Design an enzyme around this catalytic site. Structure first.
Site, PDB file in Angstrom:
ATOM      1  CG  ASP A  57       3.852  -3.936  -8.811  1.00 17.97           C
ATOM      2  OD1 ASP A  57       4.516  -2.917  -8.565  1.00 17.97           O
ATOM      3  OD2 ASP A  57       2.902  -4.300  -8.088  1.00 17.97           O
ATOM      4  CG  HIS A 102       5.585  -1.520  -4.450  1.00 15.25           C
ATOM      5  ND1 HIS A 102       4.973  -1.498  -3.215  1.00 15.25           N
ATOM      6  CD2 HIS A 102       6.102  -0.281  -4.634  1.00 15.25           C
ATOM      7  CE1 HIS A 102       5.109  -0.299  -2.678  1.00 15.25           C
ATOM      8  NE2 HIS A 102       5.792   0.458  -3.518  1.00 15.25           N
ATOM      9  CB  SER A 120      -0.183  -4.843  -2.558  1.00 21.43           C
ATOM     10  OG  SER A 120      -0.920  -3.637  -2.592  1.00 21.43           O
TER      11      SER A 120
END
Ligand code: NAG
Ligand code: CA
Ligand code: CA
Ligand code: CA
Ligand code: CL
Ligand code: NA
Ligand code: NA
Ligand code: NA
Length: 472
Positions: A44, A85, A259
């Site tokens: 990520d 994230h 996600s």
């Protein structure tokens, strides 16, 4: 067994719940499985390796910075906290337990790393070097990214990344195969259809969708036949969300989307691998198929397949069940080597027009070493022209009667570029016998006078010829 004392653990409803609307993780923890010895990497925007709820489990050998070409995946800090994230995803897998900080990871004794690879120009080489990071140390990779979820894109891994998938599943993890866990997409508002994403549509990725707390299909969900299973994530504003580690050494209760579902699945898969370290990449997909639970997930397309399992295009085989996964893993017999049966279907090109049906009766490589009586994945690899791609809907029906949607109408997909040997994949006929009549349906869902030609249809069957269970 004593459950975690962390301050936000009670808010982790998808773990700590006592009303059966959860991932049944406490049951695995009570069986003694918390992820010890397993290594997971988040691919990520980086990982805050000094986060108070990650440092205790952080593994530099599971980490790299492909964007800046150095070993340190620390995120790039900005006023907008854009690069948060990967840290959120890492805490879902492996946040430390019983330390007075935030909540816990699903596999709260696993080791956790991150690859900083989204914070820059994301080329095929960047993807390949990330998927291929330290493949005899990292067991499980989690990826909450992919082609643009605009409902008009058809794209997948280019050559280096596809080579990385085949090297990972073939030689990774001592030859047992890297486990690639993938989020199926966040394009629901755009009516996206996730078989148009070649990362989630891959057989080499274990693809995961989401359900809301009240058991519904979230606004952001994409339906497709390549999805295998589901974990909880966010929904409407009366429904709770995912609680995890956040950038700047904080704790968030508002992580969202598919996600957030893939890391929870990666954590459950880590508990499962602790229960049986010899599981192959295909074994792990079999366990998901056998143990996932439809109950109380609401969808209008639940259908019973040929071996009695309920499947949905929103949920695959249903909600992951960690206790059932670890229980079944313990005495699991390794599946036989993967066979591949290639069937070139057409003898001439076929005009599509308003509607086309192609029927073919196949023997599934009878009499050959690639004879398949027990299907795993199936693909319809299609080459076709059409003037407005998103008006097409495509279905594939197995000999057992299982109707897989390969493509739903995509209202925003105006492309005139068609499909170039696109390998639409379905998991919905897993464990069926693929001998007999297959039916391909291609339909113009609009009233417009659209036109085009199907020029190639390859039916590709993967699977084995031994070891079936009595149907459900
Ligand atoms: C792992 O499975 C393979 C294939 O069944 C078997 O040959 C091998 O002995 C197993 N290894 C362990 C450590 O169980
Ligand atoms: Ca760096
Ligand atoms: Ca904690
Ligand atoms: Ca998508
Ligand atoms: Cl192949
Ligand atoms: Na691509
Ligand atoms: Na997949
Ligand atoms: Na048959």
């Amino acid at each position: 067994y004593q459950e975690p004392t962390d301050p936000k653990f009670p808010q982790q409803w998808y773990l700590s719940g006592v009303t059966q609307r959860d991932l049944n993780v406490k049951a695995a923890w009570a069986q003694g499985y918390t992820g010890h010895g397993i290594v997971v990497s988040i691919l990520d925007d980086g990982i805050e390796k000094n986060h108070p709820d990650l440092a205790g489990n952080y593994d530099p050998g599971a980490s790299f910075d492909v964007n800046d070409q150095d070993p340190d995946p620390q995120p790039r800090y900005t006023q907008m906290n854009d690069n948060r994230h990967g840290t959120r995803c890492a805490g879902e897998v492996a946040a430390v337990a019983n330390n007075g900080v935030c909540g816990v990871g699903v596999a709260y004794n696993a080791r956790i790393g991150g690859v900083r690879m989204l914070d820059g120009e994301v080329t095929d080489a960047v993807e390949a070097r990330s998927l291929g990071l330290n493949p005899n140390h990292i067991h499980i990779y989690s990826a909450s990214w992919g082609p643009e979820d605009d409902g008009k894109t058809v794209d997948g891994p280019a050559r280096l990344a596809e080579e990385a998938f085949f090297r990972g599943v073939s030689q990774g993890r001592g030859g047992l195969g890297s486990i690639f866990v993938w989020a199926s997409g966040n394009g629901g508002r755009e009516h996206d259809s996730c078989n148009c994403d070649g990362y989630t549509n891959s057989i080499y990725t274990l693809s995961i969708s989401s359900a809301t707390q009240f058991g519904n299909v979230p606004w952001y969900s994409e339906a497709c036949s390549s999805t295998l299973a589901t974990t909880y994530s966010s929904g409407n504003q009366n429904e709770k969300q995912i609680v995890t580690t956040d950038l700047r050494q904080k704790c968030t209760e508002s992580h969202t989307g598919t996600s957030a579902s893939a890391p929870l699945a990666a954590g459950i898969i880590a508990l499962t691998l602790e229960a049986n370290k010899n599981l192959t990449w295909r074994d792990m997909q079999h366990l998901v198929v056998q143990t996932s639970k439809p109950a109380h997930l609401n969808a209008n397309d639940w259908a019973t397949n040929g071996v009695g399992r309920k499947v949905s295009h929103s949920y695959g085989y249903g909600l992951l069940d960690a206790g059932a996964m670890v229980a079944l893993a313990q005495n699991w017999t390794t599946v036989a080597p993967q066979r591949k049966c290639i069937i070139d279907i057409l003898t001439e090109p076929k005009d599509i027009g308003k509607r086309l049906e192609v029927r073919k009766t196949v023997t599934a490589c009878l009499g050959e070493p690639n004879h398949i009586t027990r299907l795993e994945h199936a693909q319809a690899r299609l080459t076709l022209s059409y003037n407005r791609r998103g008006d097409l809907a495509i279905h594939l029906v197995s000999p057992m009667g299982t109707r897989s949607t390969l493509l739903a109408a995509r209202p925003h997909d105006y492309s005139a570029d068609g499909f170039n040997d696109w390998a639409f994949m379905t998991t919905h006929s897993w464990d069926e016998d693929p001998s007999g009549e297959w039916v391909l349906e291609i339909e113009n869902t609009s009233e417009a006078n659209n036109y085009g030609t199907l020029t190639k249809f390859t039916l590709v069957l993967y699977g084995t010829a031994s070891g079936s269970l009595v149907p459900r």
